[PDB]
Structure 1
Amino acid sequence: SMSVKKPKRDDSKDLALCSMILTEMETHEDAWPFLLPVNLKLVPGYKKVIKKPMDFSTIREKLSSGQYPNLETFALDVRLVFDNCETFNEDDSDIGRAGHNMRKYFEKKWTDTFK
């Protein structure tokens, strides 16, 4: 509360570390469904169903331009990618399995880096 604060965590490396995690996810061989925005004109159903589209290149652009106020807002966009994937894709599909794999890959990096 006013004039009463927990000891100050060093956050000066967060921007660089999030960038490294995102790089490692961009180069995973199961990244291909997530590299670019889903084409809303070519994929029937997607625009109406998926209210907040998100993908790795959009995340990279936001990160590089100071549009994430902190650690948590970055992780929320990453999770949003895989939440969208689950909504639109059957678990038993190549893209469905790619989503599950990438989420697991992300959460491990996240834990080891910050938690």
Structure 2
Amino acid sequence: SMSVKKPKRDDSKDLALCSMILTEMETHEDAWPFLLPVNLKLVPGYKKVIKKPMDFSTIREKLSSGQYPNLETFALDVRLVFDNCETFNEDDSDIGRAGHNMRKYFEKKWTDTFK
């Protein structure tokens, strides 16, 4: 509360480390469904159903331009990519499987780097 603070967690490396995690996600073989924004002209249903589209390129731009205030807002956008994928794709599809794999991969790197 006022004039009463928990000890300062060092956050000075967070930007660099989120950038490393994102690089690893970008270079995974199963990243291909997530590298670019879904083309809303060419994919029926996407625009109406997926209220907040997110992809890796868009995360990378946000990251590089100071649009994440902290490491939790970065993790929210990454999870959004996988939650959108589950909303629109069958579990038993190549894209559906890709999204499960990528989410598992991300969650391990996140825990190992920060928890």
Q: Name the TM tier (shorter chain).
A: over 0.9
Cα distance in 2 for partners of 1:79, 1:3 equals 35
Cα deviation digits, residues 21-59 of structure 1 (max 9, x gap): 000000000000000000000000000000000000000
2:27 corresponding residue in structure 1? 27
2-side partners of 1:14 and 1:24: how far apart? 15
- CA deviation after TM superposition for structure 1 residue 104, in Å: 0.2
Question: What is the Cα deviation at residue 81 of structure 1?
Answer: 0.1
Structure 1 residue 71: Cα displacement: 0.5
Q: In 2, distance between residues paired with 1:37 and 1:55?
A: 6
Task: Find the aligned partners of 2:41 and 2:113 in 1 and give their Cα distance.
Answer: 38
Structure 1: how far apart are the matches of 2:43 and 2:14? Answer: 36
Cα offset for 1:72?
0.2
d(CA) in 2 for partners of 1:2, 1:111: 31
- TM-score, reference length from structure 1: 1.00
- Structure 1 stretches (4+) deviating beyond 6 angstroms? none
CA deviations 1:63-89 (Å, max 9, x no partner) are 000000001000000000000000000
Q: Distance in 1 between matches of 2:47 and 2:64?
A: 26
Deviation at 1:61, TM superposition (A): 0.1
What is the alpha-carbon distance in structure 1 between the residues aligned to residue 106 and residue 72 of structure 2?
A: 14
Q: How far 1:107 moved relative to its partner?
A: 0.2
Equivalents in 1 of 2:7, 2:69: separation in Å?
A: 20
Give the paired residue count: 115
Looking at structure 2, the residues matched to 11 and 64 of structure 1 have their Cα atoms a distance apart, in angstroms, of 17
Q: TM-score, normalised by structure 2?
A: 1.00
